[PDB]
Amino acid sequence: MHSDLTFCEIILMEMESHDAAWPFLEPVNPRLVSGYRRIIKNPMDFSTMRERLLRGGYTSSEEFAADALLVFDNCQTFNEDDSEVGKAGHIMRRFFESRWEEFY
């Protein structure tokens, strides 16, 4: 749908610009994060969804939502809930779930 994916733009822009978005704008650099490659099989981040979305690489809004949920799953997999990335991921995750349900 044009509408299904016109909305994925709105929310991704809103995540891209959220105060808590800083852990997720770029891919995690495994050279700098010991253990990340080993633990996180499928990395995901906002710039990667942005690339895929501009490219037309999403066919349904469900695919987009899967990529968003994967950012936060990988976050909670790797970081303790009281870590700084962890605290930021809970804010970004709660923002995403609520903004996504407000539409669907």
Catalog residues that contact ligand FIY under the rule CB under 6 A.
Answer: 23-24, 28, 33, 36, 75, 78-79, 85
Q: In this chain, which residue has its C-beta nearest to ligand FIY? A: 23
H-only helix segments in the chain? 2-17, 36-39, 46-54, 61-78, 84-101
Instruction: Kindly report the number of other CB atoms within 10 A of residue 54's CB atom.
Output: 9
Minimum CB separation of residue 80 from ligand FIY in Å reads 10
Query: Of 5 and 33, which CB lies nearer to ligand FIY in the complex structure?
Result: 33
Query: Of 33 and 53, which CB lies nearer to ligand FIY in the complex structure?
Result: 33
Nearest partner of 62 among 98, 104, 17, judged by Cα: 104
Nearest partner of 49 among 37, 32, 63, judged by Cα: 63
Minimum CB separation of residue 20 from ligand FIY in Å reads 11
Query: Of 24 and 58, which CB lies nearer to ligand FIY in the complex structure?
Result: 24
